[PDB]
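Annotators were shown the component list below and the corresponding predicted structure, then asked to write short factual statements about the assembly.
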Amino acid sequence: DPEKLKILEWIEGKERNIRALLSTMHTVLWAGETKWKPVGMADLVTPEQVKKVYRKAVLVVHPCKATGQPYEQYAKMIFMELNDAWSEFENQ
Amino acid sequence: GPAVGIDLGTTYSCVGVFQHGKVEIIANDQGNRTTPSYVAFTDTERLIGDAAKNQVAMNPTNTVFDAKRLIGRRFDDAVVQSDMKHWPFMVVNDAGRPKVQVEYKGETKSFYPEEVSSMVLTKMKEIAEAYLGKTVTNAVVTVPAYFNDSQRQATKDAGTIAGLNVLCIINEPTAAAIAYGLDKKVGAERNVLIFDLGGGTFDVSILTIEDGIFEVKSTAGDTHLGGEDFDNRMVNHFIAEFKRKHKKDISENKRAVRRLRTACERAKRTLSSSTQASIEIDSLYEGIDFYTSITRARFEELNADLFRGTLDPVEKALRDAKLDKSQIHDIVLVGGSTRIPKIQKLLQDFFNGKELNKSINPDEAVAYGAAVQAAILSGDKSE
Ligand SMILES: Nc1ncnc2c1ncn2[C@@H]1O[C@H](COP(=O)(O)OP(=O)(O)NP(=O)(O)O)[C@@H](O)[C@H]1O
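Structure shown to annotators:
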């Protein structure tokens, strides 16, 4: 479907690159979402910045808050890709 | 490292952990994989779990239990006032909030219900830490599906007080269904029935599953039916026998009746896989040894009405879910009383020999699924 294609294209292009995923997460969020301000690379340079923004990303898309919601399935998808992105970032 | 799953249960609590590819349900220091939700206060120690439950006869007024029934509630709640009569410990009013008043180290002391449940949670937390060799902070904690926001927020509050960071509060029959990986199947939506008979409460929930998404379609049961009642049907059987044999009524005796209750719970478990059990109490009443026997057939007979009566809430759940029984795709056995062979039969017959999901210790299934969910809410489980 159109909402799921979006996210799956997003993941594909951004290559588990956390910065790339964070600085573009606002393009895949469900219409309705207000708790997320778009973030530029300017605010994703240092590992402090990546961390601080990542911990803000996962809150928005957390599968617990998303439980029951019409977008639940997409919150999950983004969560999981971000977790993997971040662990790749931790291992680097 | 890991996040754990905790079933915070009316009568028993159980902690599990997803680790090295498997869920482990973790035994306490006494060897037990479930732990009484009991807190006892003596002159010298705060007792939690078994040590608390094991001393309830010598110290009934200070052995708190059943805090899950007070959590998220106002003192002027009908439910609080009803239940209070049944407890030997005192419940007081602190500005419209229930507290439990006890004697601890010579002093009177009161605790909020989330504080008592925090003690149980702390205990469970240590059980996991003893097994894992490190500190536990992150946990998913489960609640009944019928729990409201105030009860769910109070359960989360209990975690915080236990020094825990609660990743999510999830529903019990949903956890059990996660334990079975019922969400990891391709195809049309699935109707799942969770038949859950614990120690104090009976819960039937019907759930739909499609694309890994859960909704609760209906719930039913009885907040005052579980293994404790089958124990009672046994106690009075033996109060009566004792009387006939010795011409003494142990019924006035609270310590004597409590001691027989334990004897009784213990034999009932034996009766789930053996066809008779032995009762053996030294000096039960005014110096008299009570030794005796009971068969499974007899146990079943003393409970025949309460066993059979668990089918009403099933029927009721189906008619609220607007489903005929044949439209249920999975049935899940949860709660330690579902181990009783007669219960197994009656549910399966009701479903016309359809096979039951029970390969996972039913009293462990909730904690199991919570453990699975705690790993997922961390990133300890990918792909
Ligand atoms: N082998 C057994 N045979 C019969 N009953 C048993 C057996 N093992 C445990 N039980 C009973 O199961 C009950 C406790 O079940 P359990 O599912 O641990 O309760 P709970 O967690 O307090 N309920 P909840 O979390 O609200 O699902 C007690 O009545 C036990 O006596």
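Statements collected:
1. Residues B 7, 9-12, 34, 172, 196, 198-199, 201, 226-228, 265, 268-269, 272, 335-337, 339-340, 363, 366 surround ANP (CB under 6 Å).
2. Chain A has one domain: 1-92.
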